[model samples]
Target: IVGGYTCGANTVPYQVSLNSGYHFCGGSLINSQWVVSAAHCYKSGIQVRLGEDNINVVEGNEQFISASKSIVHPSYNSNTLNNDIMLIKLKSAASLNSRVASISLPTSCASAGTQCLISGWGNTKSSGTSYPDVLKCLKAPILSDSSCKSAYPGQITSNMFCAGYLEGGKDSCQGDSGGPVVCSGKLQGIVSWGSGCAQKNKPGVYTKVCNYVSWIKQTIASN
Candidate 1:
């Protein structure tokens, strides 16, 4: 969920906007009525917008639906930001088509340094307040937990990992939380948190999806 540059409407169809009157966070449509995001992004009022490339104007392909419920991991830690994942159940199933679709779940753990793509409508600059109406994206490489922990010492956990440039030019900025990290065409991670936008030695931290597969399946099945 970085603000590297702009992308087209369907560049990442699974990407969805979670709004509470306005853009609050980003999410990934796992199915017609299921979206996965960060638990930290949870709010009392919310809706999910699918098939939308731009968040400004209404589009014919877009589907705006109320959230039936938002389920956050019970063990989620606000202090350390661990277990920072959630599932958004839509009131109705989204109408899927070319412009609107679900993303594939990853079957294996993404190795360290694997290149992945992240998209979001967050801040354009590191210290900027303005967010984009159009989606923005960037390609970043995953970093191993060992290496990532060094930069973010005493902050890394098994449920969380880091990605981005150590040199610090590109990263997921403010308002980009709850977006996605797609690796090898599969949903790999969720944009949970980061130190700041494009900061040196501080790569973007994400909730690793691979470790939560069983929990996700169980929640989906129970729901």
Candidate 2:
């Protein structure tokens, strides 16, 4: 993430790194056996690493878990990036502790101007390769629907929302997709897409988590 600092150990306990030999996407632990991420990040053999701060070094708190199953939203559209959410069932349930835990899903929709926390190990530079070893995060306020639509024209959807400064700097980038956007300690969004990392007037877009609460519960219950 651009214009952010490395997160302290277990600071974002719900955060997880998606891997297929290497870190490709970020995810959040919603329960002992389930993780929430973006549909685009899903792969057949992907694994989930929890309680991780740095990708390179060995963290005793980290839990390396394999996926038993992966489910994407039935109506996901890769072309427009709508319905971008995905859920993964862990091969085994994660043990909860100080360095590993689950975050609650949002009870209500986020409002415009609400400052939320976004974190990932994505590219730190917008133009070139600079993926970080440690997780990084920043606080950004949700943009109004009208303002978001104005920024992306017809690209913005009701299932998505924008968060960041209009002036550029401080935004989620590639590899950050599927990461958590926690507002008031609840999972409010998931880093989905944007025109470019930290670009002016092109705030980071996220999957509106509130819209998928019922879907999530149903999926988890019936899976």
Candidate 3:
């Protein structure tokens, strides 16, 4: 996360870190056994760590679980990055506690200029390798569709939206992909892609969560 603050313990209860040897992406716990994330983070042998704040330290509250399955959106297009959301089923249900909980999915779409909370352990810099060891969060306002289209012409689709300052500064970067973007306590977006981290006129792009509420429910129901 760029221009963000270190999250306090249990502050982001639903936040999770996708680990493969190290933290590669962030996700939100939607239930005891399901996590919502960006499709781009999909791969084999993913380990989900919940209730994490400082990844560099061994926190007793952490619950590490392997993914039982990953359901990437069938319409996911890596090239255009459309339908960039995914659902991950944990190998075992997490025992919810003070530091671990699930977040609700959005029932409605977020309006333009709505402030949202985004948290992750992604790069702190726009360039190079400065991944944070602790979870970081930034509050960014959702940009209007027209404004988003203007910044990423022929790229932004109805499935995607942009957030953060158009002038630059705060954003979800490389390793932050798949992290939660919660608006009004609802999971509204998933960090997907962007031109670059915190760049001018290149706000962070995310998967519009409201558009896939039904799909998410159906997938979880059948699976």
Candidate 4:
């Protein structure tokens, strides 16, 4: 099983570290001052690190932004994992450059059968653990609305989207939450839930970014 996405030869990956020295998962730069990730990744005083590959090495160029506030979706339901999205506001704006560019949010999102890229430092296999410094990525096609509805049954809401490999060797696992599903150079989804990680016939579900554009803008503006 392969893991993480490589931006380029010189580009470094971003990561979040929780308490007890345990690193949670990966995130992406949405703007100079904000980052898009999963609500489940939010913890008081969680540290966000950017522009670095080695988890143990803290150098001059690395930006360690302490989260000032965590804004999770107000209606997020942990039981059903609905609205499983959030944004982190950094205490200070990040300094941007070629290797440290922010990803654009999609103004228009595709419906179904649209392909996207899922990136993270999650488990290489369904039962594996997250990698220390590597980030992996895979291409996933958005499932048809009917298929997603059938798979999730009573829980498939309009705010959710589904994607995965049919053969079942690849997926976003436990540690991949709060990561981006990039499509057409924009963030269209956030990793939310799946059955047994990479299980076949069970695709990874995500919070549809387009569904909450107004809420996202309002939340960010208020904060």
Q: Candidate 4's residue-wise lDDT over 38-93, tens digit each?
A: 77776777677776545566555567777788888888887888888888888899
Ranking of models by TM-score? 2, 3, 1, 4
lDDT of 3 by residue, 138-200 (tens): 999999998899998889889999999998988989889999999998999999999989989
Give stretches of model 2 more than 4 Å off.
Answer: none
lDDT of 1 by residue, 1-223 (tens): 4448777778789999999899989999999979999998989889898988878898778899999998999899999999999999999988889988899888998999899999998887877577778899999999877779899888888888898999887999777899999999999999988888887888999999999989989999899
Each prediction's RMSD to truth: 1.1, 0.7, 0.8, 2.5
Candidate 2: 10-residue stretch with minimal lDDT: 126-135
Candidate 1 — worst ten consecutive residues by lDDT sum? 1-10
Candidate 1 ranges beyond 4 A from true positions: 1-3
Q: Residue-wise lDDT of candidate 2 within 102-197, one digit each (tens)?
A: 999999998999989999999999788887888898999999998899999989888999999999988999989999999987999999999999
Superior by lDDT: candidate 1 or candidate 2 = 2
Ranking by lDDT: 2, 3, 1, 4
- Let me know the TM-score candidate 2 reaches against the reference structure: 0.98
- What stretches of model 3 exceed 4 Å from their correct place? none
Best by lDDT: 2
TM-score of each: 0.97, 0.98, 0.98, 0.88
Give the Å error, residue 145, model 3. 0.9
Candidate 2 vs. truth: CA RMSD?
Answer: 0.7
